Structures are given as C-alpha cells and as structure tokens.
Design an enzyme around this catalytic site. Structure first.
Site, PDB file in Angstrom:
ATOM      1  N   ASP B 130       0.539  -1.423  -0.228  1.00  0.00           N
ATOM      2  CA  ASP B 130      -0.396   0.314   0.069  1.00  0.00           C
ATOM      3  C   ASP B 130       0.673   1.146  -0.180  1.00  0.00           C
ATOM      4  OD1 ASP B 130      -2.355   0.971  -0.242  1.00  0.00           O
ATOM      5  OD2 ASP B 130      -2.843   0.972   1.610  1.00  0.00           O
ATOM      6  N   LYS B 132       1.426   4.910  -0.521  1.00  0.00           N
ATOM      7  CA  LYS B 132       1.255   5.660  -1.172  1.00  0.00           C
ATOM      8  C   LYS B 132       0.918   7.278  -1.238  1.00  0.00           C
ATOM      9  CE  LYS B 132      -3.646   4.567   0.618  1.00  0.00           C
ATOM     10  NZ  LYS B 132      -4.800   4.360   0.583  1.00  0.00           N
ATOM     11  N   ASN B 135       0.086   7.338   2.424  1.00  0.00           N
ATOM     12  CA  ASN B 135       0.651   6.459   4.028  1.00  0.00           C
ATOM     13  C   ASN B 135       1.843   6.924   4.019  1.00  0.00           C
ATOM     14  OD1 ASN B 135      -1.553   5.229   3.806  1.00  0.00           O
ATOM     15  ND2 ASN B 135      -1.085   3.018   2.823  1.00  0.00           N
TER      16      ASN B 135
END
Ligand code: X37
Lengths: 10, 317
Positions: B130, B132, B135
C-alpha cells in the site's frame, strides 16, 4: 491536487 | 498496563468510518503521540479484523527509522487503540498537493528512504502492498515514515506469492489486476508510482471510473515530460515496467537493483539509514501541538478470548 484515495481489500 | 485516561486528547488528525486519529500527550511523561482509535463493532462488522491484528503484529516486529513506531497497543470494551509516534510533517499527499511537483534531488531524497524501508521490510519477509502519498509521512526532522500496515502480507521471502486483491486502485501493479497470484515486486511498482507523482506532478494513469483505470494500468504506456532527466526517465521506466520479472527490483536481488540504478549514483546507502543526510525540507512547526500540515477539515474540530489475542502491547523503548 488529485482527490484522496481509499484502500480496499476484497 | 495502560488505559485511555493516561492521555490528554489535544487535536484531531484524522477521522473516518473505522475511527479517529488524535494527537495526544501521555500525562505521566509529557511525550506526544498520534493515537489511532477504532470502534471494535465497526471493525468486526466490516471484516477488517485480520488487518488490524496484522498491523499490530507487524508494528511489533519492526525496527527502522523510516517505519512508524508503536509505543502502546491496548483495547477497551468497544475500542482498539494504537499509540504510535507522531509525524509532525503531515502526509506527502499534503505537501505535493501544495508544491505540485518536486525537484529530482528532493524526489531522490524521499525515494532513497522508501527504498531503504522496503528493503528492511522485504528482509523481514513482509510485503507492504500500500505505497501511496497518503501512507508516506514526514517526521519533525523532515524524514519519511511509512504509516498504515493493515494490508501487509507476512512470511513472503524470495519468490513467494500472494492472492488477495487489495491495496489502492490508482496504485495497483498490473499483475495484481491479472487473475491468480503475485510476488513482492508489487512494492517496486508502488515506488514507481509515487516517484512519478513526485517528479511529473501527476498519477501515471487515472480515471474516476475504476473499469477504465484498470484498462489504463494494464494496457497503456507511461508518457514522460520532455525535460525530465534521462536517469529519472530510466528509473521510472524501470519501476513502472508492467512485467514484474522485467521490472527494476523485480529480479532475484530485489531492492539492490534499485539501489544500483544510476538515478541514485550520489546516494550512500550506508548513511541513508544512519540518517546523516540533511533533509531537503524541515516542517516549520512552532509548538509541538501545531497541526498546519494536516487539514483544517479535521484539526478545527474539538473532541470527545480468541479474536483480539495478539494485539495489546507495550514497547520496551
Ligand atoms: C480514520 C483512520 C482510518 C483511523 C485514518 C485516518 C487518517 C489516516 C492517515 C494518516 N496518514 C495516518 C494516521 N495519522 C497519523 N498522523 C500523524 N502521525 C501519525 N503517526 C502514525 C499515524 C499518524 C493521520 C494521517 C489513516 C487512517
């Protein structure tokens, strides 16, 4: 910009 | 043991379905943290139990300056609580929305820290899944910290595979949009998409319709701006190669192929982790309680047996 994304999981 | 009332609830940093995140101050010590507060009944109702539990297990078995650190995990009857270190600098999503596009040198700074982290995680048999802008956060010193570990897979070493269709639509590797299983290369695709956002100022592929967004990630070839450096164009073409086996960091060496690319020729990988590099950007915070790198949307508001076995936690640090 560009809109905020959302994590998924099937 | 630790309780909800060991903390002063100072500012609201995020809020969503599953709960809130609040800047808090441990009363007994003075030290400030971000607290993730989640409703157990909503977690359980929406099958997000494993993720929450993974997040705690991962956060418990990881130690790295560019990964966020868990101080406390605890629960009440209706809530789960993570007390992690506070990222004063906000999300890269925030900064990049403001600046529009970073310099290659700055992109390179952040790219190295992400790469060092994914290196670490991959060495622990964890695949992050994840990457991105949301994050990716910045600490007080200007360094990256990866937040959010719910989507991780554990015990994936060398060329182990995974099946769960998961992560974030805009950031999905082509091989995850093909039926059947996929490997740790997906993290490098991820890095390719954030570096591209940092350097070219937009997502490589985008459509509000998800059917089209996937047709894009699979079928379409990335365009690059004309005056983007050749070694930058090279790095990106390598990380956003659609075939995982041909992707940079997709071979057997993993992060090392990415470290030995000529975009990073000036980076000393021994001293990235040791944090000897002056970061290119210092968040400009007056007090400890200043939240100018989080959204007014949230910050302007004032404030209020089997299943969770491997969750509670107290850090030794
Ligand atoms: C509503 C829920 C689902 C709980 C949620 C809200 C916001 C976020 C985004 C953040 N980037 C991560 C948590 N947080 C942080 N802020 C500051 N320092 C932090 N350290 C660790 C997390 C964190 C806010 C921004 C992620 C989840």
């Amino acid at each position: 910009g560009r809109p905020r994304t959302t994590s998924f999981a099937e | 043991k630790v309780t909800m009332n060991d903390f002063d609830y100072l500012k609201l940093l995020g809020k969503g379905t599953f709960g809130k995140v609040i800047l808090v101050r441990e009363k007994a010590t003075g030290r400030y943290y971000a607290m993730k507060i989640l409703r157990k009944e909503v977690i359980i109702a929406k099958d997000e139990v494993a993720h929450t539990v993974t997040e705690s297990r991962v956060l418990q078995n990881t130690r790295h300056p560019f990964l966020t650190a868990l101080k406390y995990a605890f629960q009440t009857h209706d809530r789960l609580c993570f007390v992690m270190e506070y990222a004063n600098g906000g999300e890269l999503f925030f900064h990049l929305s403001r600046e529009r596009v970073f310099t290659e040198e700055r992109a390179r700074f952040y790219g190295a820290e992400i790469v060092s982290a994914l290196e670490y995680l991959h060495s622990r048999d964890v695949v992050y899944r994840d990457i991105k802008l949301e994050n990716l956060m910045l600490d007080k010193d200007g360094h990256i910290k990866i937040t959010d570990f719910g989507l991780c897979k554990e015990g994936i070493s060398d060329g182990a595979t995974m099946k769960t269709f998961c992560g974030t639509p805009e950031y999905l590797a082509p091989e995850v949009l093909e039926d059947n299983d996929y490997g740790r290369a997906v993290d490098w695709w991820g890095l390719g998409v954030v570096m591209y956002e940092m350097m070219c100022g937009r997502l490589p592929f985008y459509n509000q319709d998800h059917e089209r967004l996937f047709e894009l990630i699979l079928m379409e070839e990335i365009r690059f701006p004309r005056t983007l450096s050749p070694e930058a164009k090279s790095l990106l073409a390598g990380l956003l190669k659609k075939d995982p086996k041909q992707r940079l960091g997709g071979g057997p060496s993993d992060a090392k192929e990415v470290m030995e690319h000529r975009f990073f020729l000036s980076i000393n990988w021994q001293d990235v982790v040791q944090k000897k590099l002056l970061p290119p950007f210092k968040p400009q915070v007056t007090s400890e309680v200043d939240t100018r790198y989080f959204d007014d949307e949230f910050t302007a508001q004032s404030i209020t047996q089997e299943m969770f076995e491997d969750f509670d936690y107290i850090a030794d640090w």
